Design a protein around this ligand. Structure first.
Ligand SMILES: *[C@@H]1O[C@H](CO)[C@@H](O[C@@H]2O[C@H](CO)[C@@H](O[C@@H]3O[C@H](CO)[C@@H](O)[C@H](O)[C@@H]3O)[C@H](O)[C@H]2NC(C)=O)[C@H](O)[C@H]1NC(C)=O
Ligand SMILES: *[C@@H]1O[C@H](CO)[C@@H](O)[C@H](O)[C@H]1NC(C)=O
Ligand SMILES: *[C@@H]1O[C@H](CO)[C@@H](O)[C@H](O)[C@H]1NC(C)=O
Ligand code: ALF
Ligand SMILES: [Mg+2]
Lengths: 575, 328
């Protein structure tokens, strides 16, 4: 019951120090605060940071308000993806550090060869080529900072929070006469529902009504998950007597170790976890089950008749065991696909965005200049490429809910963990490298030659920057459009809204009206109105967008044609 | 616990939606349509680009036997070349003359940041208080340099003159107007002189010329509409190039009153006042003449690129049928 109305100081402390990326961006503020190495403005990090920090604060302020009112009237689990996400952020640091030093070495020699004799690159600081190369190491840390995704975290709670609510609202996972819907009481364990390997179930209170007779739909729910290749263990009952009598039932129900006291219940859970390194979901009711609920990666608590006491000590608390089908096959399965598709696109669209600086490093003396508007870095992560991936993370459906139940075999995609590996992180990294290379060199070739050259000639850096950004925004927003399978009217709105919102914002940012307000902060006045009215620039953007999307379309088409996925095989057959 | 969940399309994940599946009949057509549309676009750009007549004269003179090599060691400050070139085919329509600089990293980070935007906008406060970004050229001796920044200081300052050598052999200078060679917005929005006053002499108090500039920013052009911070050459120069090898609009050539072409085929001599030294860092200097086309300028890269992408589109399109046909 914290947040005593004067306690905003520890929330950022919980946000900043605990999270590896958060304090890095904080350490990044100090890096770019000193003008001696500041290659980007402080706006570039604060605005995404405050939005990312602010949204997370809102998502947690509401939670404590509920606790206060709850306590006013009366008077740790971590996902497999969370660890993978954590490591990849560090992996970006070393790559960011390596490139910054690498380009620093290239810059150090460039100053002794070209920079020294280049009289136009004289600044009065008698800096030896070793010292200039050292200083720019921090400059290339700042420019390539957005290689570390700033909205990676906040987006994850939004996807998980939204996915958890679909469990609450599911009319199919709702009990009529008891009037007890499903409830996801932890909103941070979602993709793991799609990665479940083991199920631990109590019998008295979960597989039965406790009023005992088996619970309706259990024989077909138990079989469905088995077809999804989830092993089911029951830790309950009284010796082989009750075991085989009901074990042989439920369509053969597998280890049936019975008689387990709650001490044995939690002990048995750890045996599979430590000696198999697999994700487990525990389902039960009553005090005797709360032991496994905590130890297991996912805890499920049936309302049952034993007592409304094991539900609040769990992660999901729907009313019937039969509702376990939709929790995993529908809600869990879609959550993993939605999450992995999000991360696969999230790292790509940042690498494809930042690495243009690296390619443009070779044509500016390795001097660490931005290839974009400084204000394009600010809004790229929160505004231009935030909603469409978020909507996909919530609304995407490879197959319908009814078809997902009829095909439990689509679940293995999560158990095997195929849609986001440590390898596929680099493929999205390579895909960012190539897209950035295409997003840079195709405009480069056009800009090397004549590009709409007349009294109004976009042959400059700013038009070069706008062209690369414009092709980038369309490419990534078309890339996410290629990723989505469930084109809801809101999914289409977000994709075109992001592109329209981008194109709308440049005009306001590039209009003469905003120039007078802040002439130094917003300096591309007239660039969009001049660069985007030229057919050669649009031919460049169309060519750039095409040559960076058709290979994706061709590769995507070949991959499903040569190695069709389980989803594609059944998605092709509508019936 | 609580009442039944609200029954809505969104809450139940039953929204009406379209499920596009990349069947062999939906992605193949866009490949040929892309290939069928790109090739004519590539052909149109390529033939149009080749129909543009361009001539470039590289006049820096680093190599021996170039007849102004003395300008690399100008014991006397004013150095002049004289390069003769011949036009095989006449130039039709508006003709633009440029200057090119190679191995000139105008996009260097220390270089690009070195400019005071508020000052360039005609700000009284930033006029006498240059931004610390243009630190090396904030002030020279006692007062701030009005066009601060490395870029403004290191302004291309040659003077390329084009002459027509007729049968009589007497040179005939051709018309050359420097006005209207910059973006409309830049002249009227982004770049402005200090406000107030009518004469530009009285509008720059307590500010010296940049060290590299021979003379201050008062009399860049006799035309009052093209002098000062809004000078067309200055704006064109300050408009940072994207790449080290770049070319910038320098002069215009308008349609001649007579029916004859703007630049009839013949002998032309380029008399250039060599003032810009770029040979220390292996810099090249060029003068480029080009004619307007109804579809942009001379971009063989875009023309060739569209031919290629339009072509590999067929190659991808045609090949993808083989995979489709085999695995039907
Ligand atoms: C055309 O531009 C060039 C530069 O691209 C000018 O050469 C530069 O001239 C300045 C003088 O205004 C030189 O600065 C200093 O000059 C003093 C003598 O006054 C000298 O003692 C210093 O050592 C220093 O050189 C500057 O160094 C020089 N640039 C280079 C690369 O040496 C040229 O004057 C311009 N000409 C016209 C007609 O605008
Ligand atoms: C260039 O032309 C001028 C005048 O026509 C002439 O005096 C000079 O000798 C010519 N030089 C060369 C190298 O043709
Ligand atoms: C070339 O231009 C200069 C500068 O106006 C002039 O003095 C000279 O007579 C011209 N002709 C030459 C150098 O043959
Ligand atoms: F029979 Al139980 F938890 F209800 F083991
Ligand atoms: Mg029980």
């Amino acid at each position: 019951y914290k947040y005593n109305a004067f306690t905003f100081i520890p929330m950022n402390l919980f946000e900043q120090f605990k999270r590896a990326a958060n304090l890095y961006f904080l350490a990044l503020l100090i890096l770019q605060a000193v003008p001696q190495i500041s290659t980007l403005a402080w706006y570039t990090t604060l605005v995404p940071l405050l939005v990312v920090l602010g949204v997370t604060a809102i998502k947690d302020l509401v939670d404590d308000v509920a606790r206060h009112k709850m306590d006013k009237e009366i008077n740790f689990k971590r996902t497999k993806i969370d660890y993978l996400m954590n490591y990849m952020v560090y992996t970006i640091f070393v790559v960011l550090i390596l490139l910054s030093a690498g380009l620093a070495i290239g810059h150090a020699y460039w100053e002794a060869q070209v920079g020294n004799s280049s009289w136009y690159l004289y600044d009065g600081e008698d800096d030896t080529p070793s010292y200039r190369g050292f200083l720019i190491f921090w400059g290339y840390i700042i420019v390539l900072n957005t290689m570390v995704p700033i909205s990676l975290y906040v987006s994850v709670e939004v996807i998980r929070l939204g996915q958890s609510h679909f469990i609450n609202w599911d009319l199919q996972m709702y009990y009529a006469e008891k009037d007890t819907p499903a409830k996801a009481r932890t909103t941070t364990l979602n993709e793991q529902l799609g990665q479940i390997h083991y199920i631990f179930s109590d019998k008295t209170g979960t597989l039965t009504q406790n009023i005992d007779k088996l619970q309706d739909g259990v024989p077909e729910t138990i079989s469905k998950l088995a077809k999804a290749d989830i092993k089911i263990w029951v830790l309950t009952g009284d010796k082989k007597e009750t075991a085989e009598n009901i074990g042989f039932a439920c369509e053969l129900l597998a280890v049936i170790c019975c008689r387990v006291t709650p001490k044995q219940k939690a002990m048995v859970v750890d045996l599979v976890k430590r000696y198999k390194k697999a994700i487990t979901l525990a389902i039960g009711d009553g005090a005797n089950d709360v032991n496994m609920i905590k130890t297991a990666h996912i805890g499920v608590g049936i309302s049952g008749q034993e007592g409304m006491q094991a539900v609040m000590s769990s992660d999901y608390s729907f009313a019937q065991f039969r509702y376990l089908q939709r929790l995993l096959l529908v809600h869990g399965r879609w959550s993993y696909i939605r999450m992995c598709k999000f991360l696969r696109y999230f790292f790509y669209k940042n690498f494809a965005f930042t690495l243009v600086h690296f390619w443009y490093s070779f044509f500016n003396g390795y001097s660490a200049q931005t290839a974009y508007e400084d204000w394009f870095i600010t809004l790229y992560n929160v505004l231009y490429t935030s909603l469409p991936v978020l909507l996909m993370g919530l609304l995407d459906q490879d197959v319908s809910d009814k078809l997902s139940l009829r095909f439990p075999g689509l679940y293995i995609v999560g158990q095997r963990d195929l849609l986001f590996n440590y390898k596929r992180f680099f493929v999205s990294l390579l895909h960012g490298v190539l897209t950035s290379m295409i997003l840079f060199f195709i405009p480069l070739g056009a800009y090397l030659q004549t590009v709409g050259q007349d009294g109004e000639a976009p042959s400059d850096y700013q038009s070069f920057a706008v062209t690369i950004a414009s092709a980038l925004v369309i490419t990534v927003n078309f890339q996410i459009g290629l990723d989505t399978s469930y084109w809801t009217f809101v999914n289409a709105f977000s994709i075109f809204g992001s592109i329209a919102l981008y194109f709308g914002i440049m005009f306001d940012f590039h209009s003469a009206g905003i120039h007078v307000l802040f002439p130094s902060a917003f300096q591309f006045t007239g660039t969009a109105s001049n660069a985007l009215r030229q057919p050669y620039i649009w031919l460049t953007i169309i060519l750039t967008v095409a040559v960076c999307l058709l290979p994706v379309v061709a590769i995507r088409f070949l991959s499903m044609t040569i190695w069709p996925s389980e989803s594609d095989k059944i998605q092709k057959h509508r019936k | 616990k609580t009442r039944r969940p609200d029954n809505t399309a969104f809450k139940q994940q039953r929204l009406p939606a379209w499920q596009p599946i990349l069947t062999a009949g939906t992605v193949l057509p866009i490949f040929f349509i892309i290939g069928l549309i790109f090739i004519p676009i590539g052909i149109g750009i390529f033939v149009t680009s080749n129909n543009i007549r361009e001539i470039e004269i590289d006049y820096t003179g680093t190599e021996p036997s170039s007849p102004c090599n003395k300008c690399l060691s100008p014991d006397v400050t004013p150095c002049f070349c004289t390069i003769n070139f011949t036009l095989e085919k006449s130039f039709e329509g508006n003709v633009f003359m440029y200057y090119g600089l190679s191995n000139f990293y105008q996009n260097h980070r220390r270089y690009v940041k070195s400019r005071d935007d508020s000052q360039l906008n005609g700000d009284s406060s930033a006029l006498l208080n240059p931004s610390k970004e243009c630190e090396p050229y904030r002030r020279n001796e006692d007062k701030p340099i009005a066009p601060c920044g490395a870029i403004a200081n290191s302004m291309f300052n040659d003077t390329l003159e084009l002459f027509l050598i007729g049968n009589d052999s007497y040179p005939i200078p051709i018309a050359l107007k420097k006005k209207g060679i910059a973006w409309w917005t830049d002249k009227n929005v982004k770049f402005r002189n200090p406000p107030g006053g009518d004469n530009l002499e009285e509008r720059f108090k307590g500010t010296t010329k940049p060290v590299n500039w021979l003379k201050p920013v008062y009399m860049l052009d006799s035309d009052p509409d093209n002098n000062g911070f809004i000078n067309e050459d200055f704006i064109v120069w300050m408009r940072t190039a994207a790449l080290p090898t770049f070319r910038k609009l320098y002069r215009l050539i308008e349609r001649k009153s007579d029916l004859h072409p703007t630049l009839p085929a013949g002998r032309y001599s380029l008399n250039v006042t060599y003032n810009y030294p770029v040979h220390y860092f292996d810099g090249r200097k060029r003068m480029i003449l080009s004619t307007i086309s109804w579809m942009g300028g001379k971009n063989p890269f875009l023309g060739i690129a569209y031919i290629a992408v339009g072509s590999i589109s067929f190659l991808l399109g045609v090949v993808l049928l083989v995979i489709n046909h085999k695995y039907r």
